[PDB]
Structure formats: structure tokens, C-alpha cells
Design a protein around this ligand. Structure first.
Ligand code: PQQ
Ligand code: PQQ
Ligand code: CA
Ligand code: CA
Ligand code: CA
Ligand code: CA
Lengths: 582, 582
């Protein structure tokens, strides 16, 4: 029974393995383990550490995968290490040869692998997907799906899913490069051959694929949501061919409706005026299928439903953060099967997963300015006056700067949130900060960044940046807050030991009490932590795993925040923690 | 009063700080701490780690030093780190700018800093000595003492001395470069200005310096132990200008007699025939002042005595391993104030530190092929029949191969031994291995290696390479042995808790019982360990620390042992360990 569909399907229930990004199909980041709890945490201790070496460091975002005592882990610069759960012995490794003309936007990171049958899977920075035998380090198949030289890569974990209609098992993966003016795409593949079953673009009017040849087209062909141009070949504006909406994070899956649930990324160029008719109003010129959660049909890759989070993303509020399936108990009576999401744009969304109908929406980060709230009968944010920054005055190649919050780095970025089955709360790794944003000149050039805006990131408050927050999904309340001097960039994990775990920027692994927020335990690993920890049972013992090594976007795009973070050291390791055997 | 001569001189007794390489002027690597002992050692646990980062890894050989609350540690590629001893937080860093064309022979490593007054001191890879303010890392002075382009470097810890006659405090340091054809030199400098007080060459007939002016000649001017050459401009064979005997490790210091006791390295080239008269006998052409232990006068830099380990070192048995100072209770009767040494050539020596006379010699490794024993009245090896390899028969471009053991890597390399004041034993980090050796052509070419020989290192035994042995210095017996699969390439620490500590090439920091040799405790750190561990007490707690990050000579010169070692991960980091509070 070596990695079957039901092992995957049951994966949030079985404490002795971890088979995918999220610790379940619902991506709840929850575990029923209680060996480690709030009265004995004070004793947690490192069991062993593995260093990735090779003189290759930079950000380490990977969530590890454990199956039958082998941790499968990914490292920067497209590597995969297979390790003995109990000792930290190395079993095998794979190194991808990386061309010299790669261009990932926000550091050479990788977020995980998937296991199915006897194979291990992961995406690579030159835009490929590789399959390896879980026992050997032997490559079984490789497919390169896009031109890296034009801006594509892959940084996110792939997932496995089963079509409840056709019976087939699929490998689901996304793509990356909104910043480079790429057309984002979603894909399905055959696990044993890596052959393209289906391909689906997420900018409105683009041509999708099915069993090898073209199929249908995403929405209307005329593409009413993007501005027309009766001079260019397409009739549409240039941005239309460089639109964006790339799903650079991972899917989530619901067996009960036979639906894939995935986020779409920000549209291209950043500038709202490249995607609005001259003269014109950026209010209903939505850049259809960008910066929202998309419901997808497993059998054909056609769009089932869609709930957009920033109708005309002027700010790069990339709206593809993760979707956790929970049971929403309205506010009195009706349990609703829902999606939950803590977006880049500062608000928390409760969406009906049966059809993408908004149920509750509210802020999770303090002083928001681009929007006052989300108008519930309409599903649309109610913006503020100067928040789409104005075009330059005649003669100026830069326009007037406006103070926005949150900044493009967001209220929360990809690092992921956990759901607690016992307390009902979502534990969100958020940040408090803002920026100056201003318009510049916009034009597309293959292999170049395609923003069209200028920016600077800066503090919001004097005493802190990172904000661990316990949010109640029905009332929209902050049950508790833990504050930190550096930003927060690690995932969170919740357990039936009444514990919350995460890592910080200055290198500690920490444990928090899940009802009150009190700091109970920390350990200094030696580099800032930017990944999601996991936990598991092994031959009767509770284990914790965290990947260590600072990186990601802050160092390269953070502004003041790059400066704060200059003294954090680089690293590259995996660490396993547990209770002393003696 | 911050770090005075009296702090340094009582350095072996003060459990509170660590001020120099060897944890005392006698280099014993002995601690009277007993908090951690043979009955409670199984609870020892990591306290914190620090990552060196910079994407700069390779071999990490440093001995940390401690005082007030701060750890000063050295890293690969010339870098110095000051760390808070309780927390591991970084206080300051100093990165030396290195040129692109340095040429260390045996990896980019450093063995430690020294300390005196308000200053820290260390050698750099472009052959310089640097002085840093202790409280911050600003540079006070820095002296480039030789040319790196011609092959000089520095890798060994400097040390601090007080000349008893003159009252003056000196900074003592050596040089490195025997494989490139250099004149090995020892230097004494003023601690506050960096100013050369004296310079002594360890090749016979070369000129010294005293107060910036030429002083005296080492030994006889005519250098009779080096072959003559009418028709040469110097009067001597070419190799006398490139003769070696560099003091690449560190001094020991005896205040009772006022003597600086150090090792001199191997002669250059390895080829015995370039240091023998055409058609003469390698015997008595000695290659004076190479591969032995030297007693030197701190006042003038002059040689007081010399004991040769290998007289015409044909094997690169670099004869400068550490010298420990101890009291030798003869065999029966006498207490001799002695030197203790475990040579690269595989013989342990015991010598009288007042006059350089041989008291005893026996083998600490098992299958020595180059010499039968050491003749106790003569002081000389009794060499075997064809163990200096023969020249190429006329027309050949390499001579025939002979099997030698130990090989140039040694029975013991630099990785120092330790002594137990309780048990009376030496704990040596030895290895069993051997090689095929043969002759090639020899020619000097500035900035390029000067061997004149071919070689191939090979295992001796199928079940183990590394051999951790407890040696009795009065009878010559191996009282206990512990065996390891990979080479042994770290230092040893000995304590009053009945314990000896060391690190292995597969990444374990280990504890053994000192009286019987049993492994009691082990922790997996992530990469191979190649540094000497220390210990110190702070706020009633006993800390252990160790530098981690595999490297050194094996992965480059090791041959079959370069391939055994291939899958051991690089790293770079410091680790501190302690007993659990509860
Ligand atoms: O739209 C994109 O196509 C794209 C890709 C990624 C990435 O692939 O990691 C980043 C982003 N977006 C992005 O906006 C960004 O702020 C972000 C930060 C991180 C990071 O790993 O810390 N990844 C990315
Ligand atoms: O003769 C020299 O001048 C020289 C220096 C060093 C060095 O400086 O590290 C090595 C050697 N010798 C040496 O023989 C060699 O065996 C060696 C091993 C190592 C080590 O760090 O791994 N260095 C040295
Ligand atoms: Ca599971
Ligand atoms: Ca983006
Ligand atoms: Ca001391
Ligand atoms: Ca040498």
C-alpha cells in the first residue's frame, strides 16, 4: 500500500506520516498529537540536525514530507534531499542543473514536494517538473513546461488529486512570474509519465488545453474585462498578452464536490492604467481571472466558479494565498462548508465553497487605507479616493506618491496559517508596515520586470513588525496577539497539545499557548526561519520538523525592512525536535 | 586589567575563561570541571547554534576562545566572529578582504585567535596578521609579512608570551607554505604596534633579524647538511633556497626556563634526491632544521636546542605536530620535565624540555613500514631497506612504486591530542591507512607546487580508518582503542569528569569514558567535525562548545579516502551544549 489515493485522502487523520503541503487536502495544518503539550514543552529538545551544504544558501521555504521513516525535503537552488527520520542519515539527493539565465522574482526558493505511489515530485527554477523514484535518486520523467528566458519559473509545491468522475489520479501544479508579464497557467499531469492531461490559462479570453490539443477558452473571447485597442492584432491592450494571474502557491481539494481549489495571482503590469481604457475608470475593468480564488473541474480544467479578492489590483496584492476548508457555523445555526483566506490586501474572507459566494469578510491587520471594508451584498471592496496612484503630470516620468497600507508585501504573504480543531481559531502570521507608491512609465520587454510603479517599504509602528494573531472566524475578532521586532515569514502549525508553533526572523523556533498567546518555549537554530513546521509520530514518539535558512522577498524588496534584516545570517539545514528519551 | 600576562599564564586553572589554543601554555587540553561527568553525560543537550552563512563554507578548524561574556571564533575564508556566550547572538564580524590568488595547500582554514589586553589577534590567508579592538571589531594594526603569490600563507593560531629576562610581552606566529618552496619563518611582534621584534628562519644557514636589522645565521653559515653546488650562485643546490621547515601550527611556552617550544615543518621538495648530493647518501644530509621540535629564546629569536623527528624527510612527514608539556615519571625513578608529541611519522616522542634529549620513543599506529624503531642511544630512526623510493630509470618520466605507511597524511595530522592529569594518559586522534609512492621530475616554478613525487592514499584495514587511542607514555602501551569508519580529523578535550571528547567525519560530537574507552553519548550536528572542542563555566553552569563544518586536507589529497568522504555535507557553524536545567 505504498502511497495510494486514500492514504493521501486520509492524511490529516494518520499521525505517523505527512504527505503533502498542508497536512491534508483541506490544508488545515492541524494534528491530533498530544505527547508534546503545554505542561511539558519546556523540555523539548533538538534530536539532530542535517546541513544542506554545497555552499548554496539563500531562503529555505520548504515544507517537509515524511513517509515510512523517510523525510523528503527540498532546498534552495532546486535540490531534493531524502533523510532517515530517526538518525539524520542521508539516503540520496538530487541536484538540478540550472541554466544561467533563470529569473525567479523573489529568491531561489522551493516550497515542497508531493509523494504518490513510488515517486517523489517537485518543481524547478528553470520551469520544469521532475519525477524521482522515492527509493533511488533516479529520475523517472522530466518535463519543462515554459520558457524561463521569458519570465516563468516554479516555486510552489504540487499536490495529487483524484477525479471522482473519470477515476484518474492527477498531479496538480501551477506557474510563476506575474512580475515578468507572463500569462499564468494551471496544469494537470499523469503521475507516471508526466504527460499533459490539461492546461488552463487564468487571464480571460485565453485558450486552454485538453488531452493534447486546444479545447475551450477562459470565459468570453472578446474578454470584456480588459480594455480594447482597435490598432493591435488582438484588439486588446498589450497587458492582455502579459496578463498574469499565475497560481504560484498550491491547490487544495474537496472530494465532496469534485473540485480543485486554487488561488490566482496578481495581474501584469502593476500599474492600473496599463489595464484601464485611456480616460476611463478602473471600476469594472476587473482583470478577469486574476487575484482571486478559482474553483476547478478536475476532469477538464474548466473553471467551475471564482471569487475575486482585489477586482483591479493596482497594488500587487497577489490574491492566491492558501484556502483552508473549514466548517463555518455562520453566526447562529447554519453550518456552511467554506473556504477561509487571509489575503495580501489585509482582509479575511469566508467563501461558500459550493459556489464561491462570499459569507463573511473582515480586516486582520490594523490601519488599512486602500479600502474601508468589503460590502457584503456586492462582494466588492469599497475603495478610498486617492489610493490608485495618479499618472504623472505632463512632463513628469514619475507621478505623485501616495501612502498605502498594506504594502505590496501584504498583510500576510505566502507563509501559511493553521486551523485549530479544538479552539475554532485561525492562527495568522501577519505583519504591520506600509509604503510610498507612485506611477512610472509602463512598457513590456521580454525578460525584463514589468511593473510600471516605484515603491518604498517602511515601518507602521516603532516597536514591532510581525504580528502573531488569533482570529475568530465568526465574529472577526482578535482573540490574542504576539508581537515581534522582525517581520514574520514562517508557516504556523496547530496541535491538540494546546500549542501553536512558528519560527521568527532572528532564528528562534517557538511554541505558544493556543488559548492565551503566551510564549512557552524557544530555541535558537542559528539562521532566520522561513518555512512551515510539521509534526509526526515515530515508533511511539512525537517529532517536530522545521527547515532553517533565511531568505525570500524581504532581503531583496523590503526597503527599510531589507535594512533591518541585513544582520541575519544565511543557513541551510533541517532540524528535528522531540522529548528527551531518558 | 583586561587579560594580562597572569590571566594567560594561569589559563589552565581558571574554569571561567579560555584564552589560547591548547587551553594553557603547556597545551594540555585538560579541564578540572566535573559538572558534566561519566554518570550524567547521557543528558547533555544543545543550548544554541550560530550559522556562519555568507555561502562561504569549506573546513572549519577553529578553536574558539572565551572571556568576560564573549566567544571569539574564526571561520573559513579569513573571517572572525564575536558571539554572546549565553544567547548565541552575534556582536560583531570582521571579514578580511582576500585577493583572488592566495594558494593555501590544504583548504581555506583557520585554527584560532589569541588575546591580550583589549585586543584579539589572528592570521589570514594572504599571509598577514591582524589586530582587532575586542569590544568592537575595528582594526588597530595589520602586517602583511610575506608574499602570497610565491606561496606563503598563515593557518595556525598565534600565541602570547612573556620574556622573563626583558619583561616584554610578545605575539608569536609562524608561516605556512612548504609545498610551494618557501623558507619557513617564526616571528615575534609587539602586541600594540604589530612591529617585528625578531624573525628566525628554520632552514640552516639563512639569516635572522632582530629589531629590524639582520642579526645572526641559523646554525652554521655553510649549511653542511644541505648539498653543495659550485656553479650555483648561492654555493648550494637549488632546494636550499626553497627548503621549507615552516612552523605552520602553534608554539608552547615554558616560563621556568624562558623557552618558546615549537615544531618546524617538512623540508621542500618531498623528493629526497633533490636534497642529496648526486650519487651520495640521503643519510647525513639531514636537511637541518626541518621536521623536528625547536627550543627558542624569546629575547633574540635564537635556537637554544633542536630534536629532529625524521632526518631527511622523504615522505612529507611534517614534523611540527603540537608539543605538550608534562611531568614524565621516568620508567622507574626520575621525574623529567618533558615534551610529549605524536608525530606524523607514527612514532610518539617524549623529550627533555631543558636540553632537547630523547627519553623514550614507541609507535602509536600499527603497521609502520619506513622504520623499524627509534634507536634510543643515537636518537635516530633505523630505516628499512627500500623505503625511500628510487629514481626513474633512464628514459622514464616516473620512478617505480613502493608501499609506505603511514602515508604523507600521517599517523596523526594537526588535530591535537589531550592529556589527563587524573589518568596519566595521552588521547591521540590517529588513523590507519597507507600509500603507493613514487618519484617524478623536480623543478621550482614560482607560485606552483614543488613536490617531485606521485602518490595514492589507500586503506590499511577493511573495517575502520580512524583510531582513537589512549596511550601510556611510560610503558608505550595502547590502554584502550575506539574505532571509526572514516578518518579522525578533530581535536580531543579531556576533563576531571572521567571524560574525553571528540568529533567524527560523519557529523557526531561524542563522549567516551577516559579509563575504559566506552562511547557514552553522541549528538548529530549535520556535517563532519574537524576542530578542537573547549569547555568553561558560567553562572554555575558547564558549557561545552565545538566548531562544525567539514573540510581540511582529506577531500583534496586523500585519494581513496577523498572518495570515501565524498557524501559528507559542508556546513559552517558553532554549537554550545549543556546539562538540562531541571
Ligand atoms: O506573482 C508571482 O508570479 C510571484 C511569485 C512569487 C514566488 O514565486 O515565490 C512571489 C510573488 N509572486 C510575490 O509577490 C512575493 O511578494 C513573494 C514573496 C515570496 C517569498 O517567497 O518570500 N514569493 C513571492
Ligand atoms: O607544510 C606546510 O607548510 C603545510 C601546512 C598546512 C596548513 O597550513 O594547513 C597543511 C600542511 N602543511 C600539511 O602537510 C597537510 O598535511 C595539512 C593538513 C591540513 C589540514 O588542515 O587539514 N593542513 C595541512
Ligand atoms: Ca498523515
Ligand atoms: Ca507578484
Ligand atoms: Ca582558563
Ligand atoms: Ca606539508
Amino acid at each position: 500500500k505504498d502511497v495510494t489515493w486514500e492514504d493521501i485522502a486520509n492524511d490529516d487523520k494518520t499521525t505517523g506520516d505527512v504527505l503533502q503541503y498542508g497536512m491534508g487536502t483541506h490544508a488545515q495544518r492541524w494534528s491530533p498529537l498530544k505527547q508534546v503539550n503545554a505542561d511539558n514543552v519546556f523540555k523539548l529538545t533538538p534530536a539532530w540536525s542535517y546541513s544542506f551544504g554545497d555552499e548554496k544558501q539563500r531562503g529555505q521555504e520548504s515544507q517537509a514530507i515524511v513517509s515510512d521513516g523517510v523525510i523528503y525535503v527540498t532546498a534552495s537552488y532546486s535540490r531534493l534531499f531524502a533523510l532517515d527520520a530517526k538518525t539524520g542519515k542521508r539516503l540520496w539527493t538530487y541536484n538540478h542543473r540550472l541554466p544561467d539565465d533563470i529569473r525567479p522574482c523573489c529568491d531561489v526558493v522551493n516550497r515542497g514536494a508531493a509523494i504518490y505511489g513510488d515517486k517523489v515530485f517537485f518543481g524547478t527554477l528553470d520551469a520544469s517538473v521532475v519525477a524521482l523514484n522515492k527509493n533511488t535518486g533516479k529520475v523517472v520523467w522530466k518535463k519543462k513546461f515554459a520558457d524561463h528566458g521569458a519570465g516563468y519559473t516554479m516555486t510552489g509545491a504540487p499536490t495529487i488529486v483524484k477525479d471522482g468522475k473519470t477515476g484518474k489520479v492527477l498531479l496538480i501544479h501551477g506557474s510563476s512570474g506575474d512580475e515578468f508579464g507572463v500569462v499564468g497557467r494551471l496544469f494537470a499531469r499523469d503521475p507516471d509519465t508526466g504527460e499533459e492531461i490539461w492546461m488552463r490559462p487564468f487571464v480571460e479570453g485565453h485558450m486552454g488545453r485538453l488531452n493534447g490539443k486546444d479545447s475551450t477558452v477562459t470565459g468570453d473571447v472578446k474578454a470584456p474585462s480588459w480594455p480594447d485597442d482597435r490598432n493591435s492584432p488582438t484588439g486588446k491592450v498589450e497587458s492582455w498578452s502579459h496578463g498574469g494571474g499565475a497560481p504560484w502557491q498550491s491547490a487544495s481539494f474537496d472530494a465532496e464536490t469534485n473540485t480543485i481549489i486554487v488561488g490566482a495571482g496578481n495581474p501584469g503590469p502593476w500599474n492600473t492604467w496599463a489595464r484601464t481604457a485611456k480616460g476611463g475608470n478602473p471600476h469594472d475593468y476587473d482583470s478577469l481571472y486574476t487575484s482571486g480564488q478559482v474553483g476547478v473541474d478536475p476532469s477538464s480544467g474548466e473553471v467551475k466558479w471564482f471569487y475575486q479578492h482585489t477586482p483591479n489590483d493596482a497594488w500587487d496584492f497577489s490574491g492566491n494565498n492558501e484556502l483552508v476548508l473549514f466548517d463555518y457555523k455562520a453566526k447562529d445555526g447554519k453550518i456552511v462548508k467554506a473556504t477561509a483566506h487571509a489575503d495580501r490586501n489585509g482582509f479575511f474572507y469566508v467563501v461558500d465553497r459550493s459556489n464561491g459566494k462570499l459569507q463573511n469578510a473582515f480586516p486582520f491587520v490594523d490601519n488599512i487605507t486602500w479600502a474601508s471594508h468589503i460590502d457584503l451584498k456586492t462582494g466588492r471592496p469599497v475603495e478610498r479616493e486617492g489610493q490608485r496612484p495618479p499618472l504623472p503630470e505632463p512632463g513628469q516620468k514619475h507621478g505623485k506618491a501616495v501612502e498605502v497600507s498594506p504594502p505590496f508585501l501584504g498583510g500576510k504573504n505566502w507563509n501559511p496559517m493553521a486551523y485549530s480543531q479544538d479552539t475554532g481559531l485561525f492562527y495568522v502570521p501577519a505583519n504591520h508596515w506600509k509604503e510610498d507608491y507612485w506611477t512610472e512609465e509602463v512598457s513590456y520587454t521580454k525578460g525584463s520586470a514589468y511593473l510600471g510603479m516605484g515603491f518604498r517599504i517602511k515601518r507602521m509602528y516603532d516597536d514591532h513588525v510581525g504580528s502573531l494573531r488569533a482570529m475568530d472566524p465568526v465574529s472577526g475578532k482578535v482573540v490574542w496577539e504576539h508581537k515581534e521586532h522582525l517581520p514574520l515569514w514562517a508557516g504556523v502549525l496547530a496541535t491538540a497539545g494546546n500549542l501553536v508553533f512558528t519560527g521568527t526572523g532572528d532564528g528562534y523556533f517557538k511554541a505558544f499557548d493556543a488559548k492565551s498567546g503566551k510564549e512557552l518555549w524557544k530555541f535558537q537554530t542559528g539562521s532566520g526561519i522561513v518555512s512551515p513546521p510539521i509534526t509526526w509520530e515515530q515508533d511511539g514518539e512525537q517529532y517536530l520538523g522545521v527547515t532553517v535558512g533565511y531568505g525570500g522577498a524581504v532581503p531583496l524588496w523590503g526597503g527599510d525592512m531589507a535594512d533591518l534584516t541585513r544582520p541575519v545570517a544565511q543557513g541551510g539545514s533541517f532540524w528535528v525536535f522531540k522529548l528527551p528519551s531518558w
